[PDB]
Amino acid sequence: DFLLEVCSRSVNLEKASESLKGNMAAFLKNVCLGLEDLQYVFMISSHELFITLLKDEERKLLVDQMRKRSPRVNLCIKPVTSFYPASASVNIGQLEHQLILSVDPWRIRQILIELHGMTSERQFWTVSNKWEVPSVYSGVILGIKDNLTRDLVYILMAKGLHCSTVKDFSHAKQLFAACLELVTEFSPKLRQVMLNEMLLLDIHTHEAGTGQAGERPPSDLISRVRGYLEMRLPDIPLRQVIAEECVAFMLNWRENEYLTLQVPAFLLQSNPYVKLGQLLAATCKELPGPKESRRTAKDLWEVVVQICSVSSRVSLIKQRESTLGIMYRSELLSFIKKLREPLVLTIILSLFVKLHNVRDITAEHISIWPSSIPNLQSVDFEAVAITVKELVRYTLSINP
Amino acid sequence: FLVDTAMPDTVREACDRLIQLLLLHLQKLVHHRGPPPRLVPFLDALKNHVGELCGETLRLERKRFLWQHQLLGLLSVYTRPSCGPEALGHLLSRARSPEELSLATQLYAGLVVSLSGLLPLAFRSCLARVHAGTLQPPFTARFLRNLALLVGWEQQGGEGPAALGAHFGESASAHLSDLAPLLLHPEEEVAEAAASLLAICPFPSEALSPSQLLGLVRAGVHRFFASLRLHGPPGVASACQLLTRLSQTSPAGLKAVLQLLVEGALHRGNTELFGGQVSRNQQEVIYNTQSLLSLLVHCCSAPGCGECWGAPILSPEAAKAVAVTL
């Protein structure tokens, strides 16, 4: 308004000739053109001087072309539905279609209750094959005596996992919490399955939204991961991917003291993933030391080389079996592909570059791995070339 | 024929009941027995016509469009190559109004409960068609501006994008390299559509590759300079926003954009816009120079009430780089 008052007090209209009128109009137009907030465009737009100089038809084109600079958009997000309930069958089908489109757990529970009431014994978990469940958990999820409870638990599981897939973790959290609170009454094994599923979903959520900018977890996710890594519970069915992401997160945030010292002894014998996490943590914490680092770099070397070895034409990629390693080659590649930490990534690149140098390529801490290897014939140099190519592509994806 | 004969009123109602019960039955089939998949010969003759199918649904008539849309949802859920991305790409690159484009959001909302990764494949597929001779330029422009509307609508987060939950911005960001050559594409409408997508489309979360960063920067300055040569100060904001967004990326990108903007300003091209020697109106020269110098000040000035009249401090290093380039 100081600009516009100065403009008005200095223009001296009806005697300013055409040149000054045009130049003042241009200045006002182009001081609108750069305005980031349209309300200010509105300021000069309402001003009497603005209306006075230019014309009665370019002001409208100006205001509309500044409105389309940041247009407001309204769109229908709700799915189409040809709902119109005459017969029992049409009612059943329309309600099952809604069951498909429903993602809030309470609406699903309502539609499942009404369908089980209207029908006699038909299950409604199978009204869509696109609903998936891990096979280690299908057997337990089908052991509930109540049909409606089993159906609701299944549909909640499937919708929560598929939501976790599409990175819409709010819905997954809601659905999973509903299932967990519903299953606390009758089945402790299903409660433990739900606990692990919440743990994995929270880890995924943190690393998707809560991280991505370098903020510490609230330290209870770390405690939950720690408790999950020390269950010692044989009856509970487990997914190895939950443990894999536990170790991947745990090694993402440099907490190498626990994996090096506080890890239970039996876990290293049991889970190869925890063992690899410990080895990377130990070989990353000792980088300052020329000699102390070698004590862990040595077993990291041997573990990785027999990982890429072939026991007995045979190829590691073509067969994927006959390997001496405790960990699969593609599983090792995936486990690495959940690491975004730069120090561990460069350690791993030096590990596979030195391995690809024997039969050069230089990758930072390249003098830390030993040179002489046992069973040089057993390792697959073509497999290591493939693994190093994929590994370097992933590393140039994380930090381009 | 059936849809034409659902719109003798008794025969109309007969066809209407037929198509509704047929949709109920197909929906039971495509989604059941959760074992080899069932076969629906009816749908298996439709995958060749899914694109044609989309066209009918995009006519947005009174009642046929609803049936066709549920048909597309069912077909997509059925087809093992998951034709859902193909349907979404057709809806995106064919819609012409916000209401038609609402169909694509409706379709994805119906899909995301059964299908996953449809935005990456839809774009990975749409931009793949783009890098070829198909998808005549108006169609690609329609796809690009519908994507621009999608990312803008998602950015102004309310209840809509909160519930749809697409991540349009990310799933268009991972294709910034594929969008970049289009800013050199000859026909102006595709170029501006790509630029206006880019200005608002977020850069990848990790970083921009030096090849990506530099190609984006060159494309942005070319758009900015060409945007200006044809539109002038009003029509460059897109590029400018992008350039400014590029110039705050990192000191490498800042120095690259400042050096390339200063060099392109002083090349034998982009010199007659600023009174360069080898008659032109002066007024346009002052205001072209206004846009270029405002961009430079935006790129140069430090981002981020500091009193009501104060002004942001120009950084020393940006002016140092402008100095050495000069």
Taking the mean position of all CA atoms in its chain, how far away is CA A198? 14
Residues in contact with B188: Cβ distance below 8 Å, sequence separation at least 6, in sequence order: B230
CB B96 within 8 A of CB B142: yes
Closest-CA residue in chain A for B72?
Answer: A80
Q: At what angle do helices B237-247 and B282-300 cross, to 10 degrees?
A: 30
Query: Which pair of tokens denotes residue B64?
Result: 């046929």
3-state SS, residue B276: coil
CB B27 within 8 A of CB B74: yes
Q: Please report which helix (H) or strand (E) contains residue A343, including its range.
A: helix A342-357
Q: How far is CA A330 from CA A60, A116, A271, A343, A355, in A?
A: 62, 44, 17, 22, 17
Alpha carbon dihedral B113, B108, B35, B32, in 10-degree steps, equals: 70
User: Phi, psi (5° rounding) for residue A78?
Assistant: -75, 140
Closest-CA residue in chain B for A99?
Answer: B113
Residues in contact with B230: Cβ distance below 8 Å, sequence separation at least 6, in sequence order: B188
Query: Which pair of tokens denotes residue A312?
Result: 């007995």
Taking the mean position of all CA atoms in its chain, how far away is CA B276? 36
Contact flag B66-A125 (C-beta cutoff 8 Å) = no
E strand intervals along chain A: none
Contact flag B99-A23 (C-beta cutoff 8 Å) = no
CB B56 within 8 A of CB B68: yes
Closest partner residue to A80 (CB to CB) among B34, B106, B160 is B106
Q: How far is CA B304 from CA B199, B201, B253, B301, B314, in A?
A: 20, 22, 19, 9, 12
Contact residues, A window 37-56, toward B, CB-based 8 Å cutoff: none
Query: Which pair of tokens denotes residue A112?
Result: 């499942």
User: Phi, psi (5° rounding) for residue A187?
Assistant: -140, 100
Residue reference for tokens 């223009």:
A11
Closest-CA residue in chain B for A36?
Answer: B237
The total number of residues shown for chain B amounts to 326
Resolution to 1 decimal, in Å?
3.2
- On chain B, the residues whose CB falls within 8 A of the CB of A70 are 152
3-state SS, residue B271: coil
Q: Please report which helix (H) or strand (E) contains residue B217, including its range.
A: helix B210-231
Distance CA B96, CA B99 (A): 8
Distance CA A174, CA A181 (A): 11
Residues in contact with B231: Cβ distance below 8 Å, sequence separation at least 6, in sequence order: none
Find which of A119, A128, A132 to mutate to test the B interface (most B CBs within 10 Å of its CB).
Answer: A128
Distance CA A63, CA A79 (A): 35
Distance CA B286, CA A124 (A): 71
Q: What radius of gyration, in Å, describes the C-alpha atoms of chain B?
A: 25
E strand intervals along chain B: none
**CA nearest to A75, candidates B145, B111, B103:** B103
**CA nearest to B147, candidates B132, B117, B164, B127:** B127
Distance from CA of A295 to the nearest CA of B (A): 34
Contact flag B116-A77 (C-beta cutoff 8 Å) = no
Distance from CA of B126 to the nearest CA of A (A): 20
Distance CA A173, CA A272 (A): 30
- On chain B, the residues whose CB falls within 8 A of the CB of A33 are 233-234, 237, 291
Its sign, for the CA torsion B251, A70, B172, B186, is: negative
Distance from CA of B116 to the nearest CA of A (A): 6
DSSP A309: B
**CA nearest to A250, candidates A272, A283, A217:** A217
CB B256 within 8 A of CB B213: yes
**CA nearest to A226, candidates A199, A208, A207, A254:** A199
- On chain A, the residues whose CB falls within 8 A of the CB of B208 are 400
Q: How far is CA B252 from CA A5, A357, B33, B217, B246, in A?
A: 42, 33, 56, 11, 10
Plot region of B319 (φ>0 → left; ψ -120 to 50 → alpha; else → beta): alpha
